[PDB]
Amino acid sequence: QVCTGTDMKLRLPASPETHLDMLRHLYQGCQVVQGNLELTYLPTNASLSFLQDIQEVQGYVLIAHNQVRQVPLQRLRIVRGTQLFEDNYALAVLDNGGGLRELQLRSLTEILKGGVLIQRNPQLCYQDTILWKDIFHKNNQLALTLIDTNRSRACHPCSPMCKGSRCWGESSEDCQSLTRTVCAGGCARCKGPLPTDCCHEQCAAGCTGPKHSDCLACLHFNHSGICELHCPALVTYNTDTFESMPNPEGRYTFGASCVTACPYNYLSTDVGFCTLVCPLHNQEVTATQRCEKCSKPCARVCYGLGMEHLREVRAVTSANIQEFAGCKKIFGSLAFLPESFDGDPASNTAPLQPEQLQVFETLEEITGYLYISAWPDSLPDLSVFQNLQVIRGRILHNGAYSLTLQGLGISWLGLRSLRELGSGLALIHHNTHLCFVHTVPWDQLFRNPHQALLHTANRPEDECVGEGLACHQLCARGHCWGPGPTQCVNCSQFLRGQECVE
Amino acid sequence: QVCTGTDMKLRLPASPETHLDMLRHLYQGCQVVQGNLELTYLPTNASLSFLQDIQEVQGYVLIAHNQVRQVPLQRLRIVRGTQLFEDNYALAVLDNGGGLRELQLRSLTEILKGGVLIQRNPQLCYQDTILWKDIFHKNNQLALTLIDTNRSRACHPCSPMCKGSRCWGESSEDCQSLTRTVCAGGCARCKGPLPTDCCHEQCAAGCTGPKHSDCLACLHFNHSGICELHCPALVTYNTDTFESMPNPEGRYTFGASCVTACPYNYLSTDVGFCTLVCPLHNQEVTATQRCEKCSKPCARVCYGLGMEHLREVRAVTSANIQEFAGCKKIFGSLAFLPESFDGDPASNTAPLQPEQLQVFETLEEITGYLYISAWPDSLPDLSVFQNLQVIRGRILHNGAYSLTLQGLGISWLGLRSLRELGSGLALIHHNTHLCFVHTVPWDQLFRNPHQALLHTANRPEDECVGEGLACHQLCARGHCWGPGPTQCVNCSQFLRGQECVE
Numbered sequence A, B: 001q002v003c004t005g006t007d008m009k010l011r012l013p014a015s016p017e018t019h020l021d022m023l024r025h026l027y028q029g030c031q032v033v034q035g036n037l038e039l040t041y042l043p044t045n046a047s048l049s050f051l052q053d054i055q056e057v058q059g060y061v062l063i064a065h066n067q068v069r070q071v072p073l074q075r076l077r078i079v080r081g082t083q084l085f086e087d088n089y090a091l092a093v094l095d096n097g098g099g100l101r102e103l104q105l106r107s108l109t110e111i112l113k114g115g116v117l118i119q120r121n122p123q124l125c126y127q128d129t130i131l132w133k134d135i136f137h138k139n140n141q142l143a144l145t146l147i148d149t150n151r152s153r154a155c156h157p158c159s160p161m162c163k164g165s166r167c168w169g170e171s172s173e174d175c176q177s178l179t180r181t182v183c184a185g186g187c188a189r190c191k192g193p194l195p196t197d198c199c200h201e202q203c204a205a206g207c208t209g210p211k212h213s214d215c216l217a218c219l220h221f222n223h224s225g226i227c228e229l230h231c232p233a234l235v236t237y238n239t240d241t242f243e244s245m246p247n248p249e250g251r252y253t254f255g256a257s258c259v260t261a262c263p264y265n266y267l268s269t270d271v272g273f274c275t276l277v278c279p280l281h282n283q284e285v286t287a288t289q290r291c292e293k294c295s296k297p298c299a300r301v302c303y304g305l306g307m308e309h310l311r312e313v314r315a316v317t318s319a320n321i322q323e324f325a326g327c328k329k330i331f332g333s334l335a336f337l338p339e340s341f342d343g344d345p346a347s348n349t350a351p352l353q354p355e356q357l358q359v360f361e362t363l364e365e366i367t368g369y370l371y372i373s374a375w376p377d378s379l380p381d382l383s384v385f386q387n388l389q390v391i392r393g394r395i396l397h398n399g400a401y402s403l404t405l406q407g408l409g410i411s412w413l414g415l416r417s418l419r420e421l422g423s424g425l426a427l428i429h430h431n432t433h434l435c436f437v438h439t440v441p442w443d444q445l446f447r448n449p450h451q452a453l454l455h456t457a458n459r460p461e462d463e464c465v466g467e468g469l470a471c472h473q474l475c476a477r478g479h480c481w482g483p484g485p486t487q488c489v490n491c492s493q494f495l496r497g498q499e500c501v502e
């Protein structure tokens, strides 16, 4: 029902051959996009039906570089704009030149933060007749709007049935619904001219009815369809007797909604906030994980890429490789790029040697993502990560992937202890020699139904079956990571150390 | 500006000679009564000017058994009724026969919960002309009014200037201000007939304007002149990044107000509530006072009277004396009544012995109160509580006193280590042989300007001097709990053990 967006931000798809599959997995069934809705480099005739349930986008909506003549975003209602494209635009429609014809954002009626950028769409006909000041929030009138009207297409007139000559398309139902401007009273959203039609303060993007339950969208926090300023607290305060007591109606805060229980792969705080990182002076404990204060001073934590000093660091290099020595859990991500194993003439960074990768021998959990686009050609497997068990995926590469392996010379995967990909997708593609990709029970590693494995251009199964590469005769269910007795997922018989032995 | 309230609840004052002084100390300068405002057994021409600043009563207002002809409450605006007299009345005027002549509650325009009980006042005049349905809040329309109109007065007619014939008194100033039944709209409160004139949804008891600042009283939580559903939480939730952050605007919740720093003698909680007891699985600790969750199960905490199994226990007896064996800190109060030492044949309770009281040797701090109305006649002092340092007074006997000593044969106080009375008053009275009351530095023991020592019917200081029970010379500033060099509060020379030596 809820899903996270992508951080591609106009960059080219890493795997174009599976780009469409990634979007379908990320958005099939999703109603609330907790992030940016980015629809880019989509080919002509692409089946985008999976987008038809999306109602609310938390970040920005970026439609760009597409040849699809239409995008099925009709149900979409509110773009909160909590994250913006170029920092100024909540809806960005760029370089759709085949190409986008009608925006058809019929239900869109609210943009809480940010403007609109429609540029270089030689087939977009009706983007000029929309009165954007109605969609912008009562507190987002600073929203800049830059719309390019240079359209190659001969533009059909706005539909007769449509009023005010404001249309999202040529269809009669493509007519714009003007909520904010119509209000006679000083109310942000109204059903009509009459004062009674005015929506409750909490209501956003219009209300089907006056009561706060009837809002089409929630300004601050949805609660089972009851919009609220703040989620009900886990504990309430008694004014008479100065005591706090548990609240039976208390709910946890997750994104823009109220949840009865903290969703999987998130941390629940004592205040009731479901987060991805623990607050300051708090540590993650298991009871499901929660953030508990470190009454004793917090122990030294190994911070991965994306966190603290390593926030802007692109990859793991010889400069920062020793920072992960002895760390059994990394709060952050690990990325190995081509320049990781080469030297930078400017920054005087020596190349990473394969002997320096053994600092990850004790690594058991990564809270972010594992991204590998380069690997020492000496090593045929990701065996430095053999003792790695969990990739949480709280931080995702490009906003979508938690495990990505690009263009590697490895012959098999060495992640024999990997049991959980908490969140995100797996992208293993263009590894000409990698064989043991389909012998891994990815369904066992995935925790969410949106999660899937995207793979293309690896060593064909034919070649693996032909040259004798397969799971060992002692593997259970033919699940394994490599050619050896030490690479099985589950072993039929009693084990001798790592080795599975009859 | 704030003060607690008494829990006499129509019972006779323990010290009638000092009852009026008790009320003056509790209410002088106070504006918000966090508790019940009980004005009982006041004599004729009693000076009651200290009540003139009271605007808000958190609990109920009880005027009863008084001889004053007028009660000086004229700025009281709201009675929240969180605690009710007999569970049905937020205002009670009973048996004021001198005697009460006019209620004169000119500014009373809101009762959040509870009704009015006016009975047996043979001099009250204008209780009938008031429209009580106006004062009662819309939620509290269930409020039952039981008003007695049996009056032995030929009363001067209601002032013609006063409209609607609703008068709190004979003077033209005493017209009842209508704020709920003169409203053209659905607003709970209104300053005028016009619909624009109604008050904000958080406004209570009326308003001077349309905004939330204007309210005369706050419905839920006052925030420095601003009425809000809740105080700003100490932490706030970021939906984009899915994490909590510290809130500089965050406020601690104290009673019906929101404050920057937790008031003294109150427990701070992580959620931001200033409480008198810690929540479940939370232990008290020094940051001041704070309530921290215990990762391990919290250790065994001794519970005094009024807490847990001893919530309905009146006094410490032989039945429950051994529950305080080895206790260093008692959660609750300690009360020694005549039946504690006499015993109860009905329950087969054995009498307390002086040997049994030694279980308090290790007692250092009492969070509630210390009440002693009986004491063994073989013990000339309170040396059993020699090692007691702090009486917090979070629980107060009759809502006013944290240290009460009445009708005892002790010749001096043995509270050698007593350095702090956190809250409440001290009532030492009718101890004929007690010669060392005034030597003690009560001012250093108190932490509030509300606190004072109420003493009467104790051994006259002239008798003290004549018999020779003067302060020990080696004591400092003439501050001695008792005779001899061991009872000095501060010792001028170096201290040998507990004995001040030359």
Ligand SMILES: *[C@@H]1O[C@H](CO)[C@@H](O[C@@H]2O[C@H](CO)[C@@H](O)[C@H](O)[C@H]2NC(C)=O)[C@H](O)[C@H]1NC(C)=O
Pocket: A001, A031, A215, A216, A217, A218, A222, A223, A224, A225, A226, A257
């Ligand atoms: C608040 O959340 C609830 C539950 O997530 C939303 O109710 C759902 O709405 C859509 C309707 O297409 C579907 O996910 C389900 O049919 C509903 N689930 C229920 C009713 O349990 C509700 O719409 C949200 N409120 C707003 C304003 O979006």
Ligand SMILES: *[C@@H]1O[C@H](CO)[C@@H](O[C@@H]2O[C@H](CO)[C@@H](O)[C@H](O)[C@H]2NC(C)=O)[C@H](O)[C@H]1NC(C)=O
Pocket: B031, B055, B215, B216, B217, B218, B222, B223, B224, B225, B226, B257
């Ligand atoms: C909210 O609290 C503030 C104080 O924190 C109140 O302001 C005081 O109001 C009293 C009258 O009740 C005055 O005598 C004081 O001089 C005021 N002090 C300050 C600093 O303003 C305020 O009135 C409260 N709000 C309401 C609605 O009662």
